[PDB]
């Protein structure tokens, strides 16, 4: 069964620049290979099939090259409409029809450090027996960030969940939401609730905290 490996996983680039995406098959599918474009909430879009040929409506900034095992997709002069996810798909040996895990073409921007906010649980929630502490990381670039919850100096792990927005159409920023969840009984026996953020726009970790009370 053929396995496509795409690189890089995520490509950060600026418009006007050249983007080069690779797709390695585990075994010559040779000519045979498509490339697809995918924007969130949208239907995939065929770009070029049989490796080098663009379908109709697809721009010239897009060219496919390659054979058997190694393939490349070059978007030679980036428009903002291309930042999407790109997938390669094989069709020499199927089923099954395989895909790579996609490459995400994202926008390079300058480093923007996160504005951090911590939010205590509402009294209303605490009556139902649970407590949600929320830490917001607002409009930062790049995307990689690190949230570390601390309760009374103890590092928490396994009791948080996180979510990141799509890159802003206007800013090219990302924001992240982290929720630390604990029982009400636990929330009440502790005091210091802190959110430690590590990001490349900071010389050192930022910590927002509050004391219950």
């Amino acid at each position: 069964e053929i396995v496509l490996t795409q690189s890089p996983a995520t490509l950060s680039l600026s418009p006007g620049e050249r983007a080069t995406l690779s797709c390695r098959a585990s075994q010559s599918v040779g000519g045979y290979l498509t490339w697809y474009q995918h924007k969130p909430g949208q239907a995939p879009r065929l770009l070029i099939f049989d490796a080098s040929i663009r379908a109709t409506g697809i721009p010239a900034r897009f060219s496919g090259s390659g054979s058997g095992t190694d393939f490349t997709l070059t978007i030679t002069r980036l428009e903002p409409e291309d930042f999407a996810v790109y997938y390669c798909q094989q069709r020499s040996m199927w089923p099954p029809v395989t895909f790579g895990q996609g490459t995400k073409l994202e926008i390079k921007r300058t480093v923007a450090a996160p504005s951090v906010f911590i939010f205590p649980p509402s009294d209303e929630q605490l009556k139902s027996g649970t407590a949600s502490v929320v830490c917001l990381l607002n409009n930062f670039y790049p995307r990689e960030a690190k949230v570390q919850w601390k309760v009374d100096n103890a590092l928490q792990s396994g009791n948080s969940q996180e979510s990141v927005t799509e890159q802003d159409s206007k800013d090219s920023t990302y924001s992240l939401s982290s929720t630390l969840t604990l029982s009400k009984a636990d929330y009440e026996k502790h005091k210091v609730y802190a959110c430690e953020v590590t990001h490349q726009g900071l010389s050192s970790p930022v910590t927002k905290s509050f004391n219950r009370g």
């Binding site: 498509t34 697809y36 909430g41 949208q42 239907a43 995939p44 879009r45 065929l46 099939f49 379908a55 997938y87 798909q89 069709r91 199927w94 089923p95 099954p96 029809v97 395989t98 895909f99 790579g100 895990q101 996609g102 504005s115 906010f117 939010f119 205590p120 649980p121 509402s122 209303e124 929630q125 139902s128 949600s132 929320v134 917001l136 607002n138 969940q161 996180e162 979510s163 990141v164 927005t165 924001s175 939401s177 929720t179 969840t181």
Partner: protein, 212 residues
């Protein structure tokens, strides 16, 4: 004006079944074969099945082999896939994609219908406040099932500095999400901020006022 429209998706319990459907348009449809490809959350694309363009060959991938059966009826421009004994590996977005004039070429795709496999019962959200002390404030839309929910701020009038996050699935099997907005700290005791939450799956509406 090639259109592939999926229908049928929904919620189901593990071990249950659904019947999906794909209606074609702007093209002569028995002519091409039809594919189902699915996209689970935080995941890529994986192929599942194709039915030739006449009625005769039907391929499946190892994994739905036994559990899934595909079909069509060109005189109607549909095609359909019955999925049985559904598991939570089956959960995701299902696209029907056309095949090239076996091409193995999905040349036009649909947007997809959503399949949810959960033993969780429908439930409307508890909406909590994320109170401010520029400031940040929001609403915590918690313990709802299933997706989705929409959030507005001040009935559509607060649109700037609004970040509504993707929901997260907790162990309860209930979802949880956040919607924040950044505003001027000078507006806090002056301007009212209300998040409008709409969870259509449960016929539930909540407006939550958030103050300091």
């Amino acid at each position: 004006q090639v259109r592939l429209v999926e229908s049928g998706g929904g919620v189901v319990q593990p071990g249950g079944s659904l019947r999906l459907s794909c209606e074609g348009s702007g093209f002569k449809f028995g002519d091409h074969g039809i594919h189902w490809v699915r996209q689970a959350p935080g995941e890529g694309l994986q192929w599942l099945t194709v039915i030739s363009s006449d009625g005769t060959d039907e391929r499946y991938t190892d994994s739905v082999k036994g559990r899934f059966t595909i079909s069509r009826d060109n005189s109607k421009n549909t095609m359909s896939l019955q999925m049985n004994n559904l598991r939570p590996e089956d959960m995701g977005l299902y696209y029907c994609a056309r095949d090239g004039k076996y091409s193995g070429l999905l040349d036009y795709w649909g947007q997809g219908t959503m399949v949810t496999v959960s033993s969780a019962s429908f439930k409307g959200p508890s909406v909590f406040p994320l109170a401010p002390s520029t400031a940040a404030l929001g609403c915590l839309v918690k313990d709802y099932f299933p997706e989705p929910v929409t959030v507005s701020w001040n009935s559509g009038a607060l649109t700037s500095g609004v970040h509504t996050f993707p929901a997260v699935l907790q162990s309860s099997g209930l979802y949880s999400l956040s919607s924040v907005v950044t505003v001027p700290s000078s507006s806090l005791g002056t301007q009212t901020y209300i998040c409008n939450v709409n969870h259509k799956p449960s016929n539930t509406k909540v407006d939550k006022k958030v103050e300091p």
